[PDB]
Amino acid sequence: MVSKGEELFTGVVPILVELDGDVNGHKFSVSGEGEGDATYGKLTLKFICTTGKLPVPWPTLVTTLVQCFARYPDHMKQHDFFKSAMPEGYVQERTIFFKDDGNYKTRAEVKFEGDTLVNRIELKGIDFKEDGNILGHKLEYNYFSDNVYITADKQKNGIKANFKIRHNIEDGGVQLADHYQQNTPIGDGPVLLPDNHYLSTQSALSKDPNEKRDHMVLLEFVTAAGITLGMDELYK
């Protein structure tokens, strides 16, 4: 049957994102607006730095700035923790370790406000090098993709995840960002605790040619995978 939070995602849902950040004492805020269509795992978002110039590269914020918009295949619907927590939502926490550099620690609450899915985030970054790839703005602005590996966390009635992002550097190299993630429901209702699986995510970054503020346009696709259930046997 059609589960309860999942009903909230059958059509196009407006999204709002609000982030406050402090990285090595450089304080900033980002606001974003757009929409998600979980039927297609599709997100279209535009973010603005509302405090002026963003003091870190936009690509390093993409993962922090709504995995409830994942397309879960029909045969995997019992493994979608994210929608099962809705509308009351979940807390999403990460530590993001930038190899040979600093780290971000993030705490977000993702929940519905009326018909709008809202992601409210606090980010704290420490131990960055002033001339490293992050504070020195040496990262390319283009595209990345990777797999979010999810496991159940029965003790917190939630999930954990781990993944790597390989951010291209302007000189041809890679800046690795190792992500550790935990999500816990805000409400007390039952949630779906999943078997191990992953979200295949592709993030394409662009600019609005008419936008003079510091900003990012994001087109993202997010698809659950990694469980077969013998869907191959249907076709001999």
Description of the structure:
The chain is an all-beta fold. It has one domain: Green fluorescent protein (Green Fluorescent Protein, Beta Barrel). 2% of the residues lie in helices and 50% in strands. It has 1 helix and 11 strands, in the order βββαββββββββ. The chain has an 11-stranded mixed beta barrel. Strand 8 and strand 9 form a beta hairpin. The longest helix has 4 residues, at 81-84. Energy-transfer acceptor. Its role is to transduce the blue chemiluminescence of the protein aequorin into green fluorescent light by energy transfer. Fluoresces in vivo upon receiving energy from the Ca(2+)-activated photoprotein aequorin. Keywords: Chromophore, Luminescence, Photoprotein. Belongs to the GFP family.
List the defining traits of the structure above.
236 residues; mainly beta; Green Fluorescent Protein; 2% helix; fluorescent protein; CFP; fret
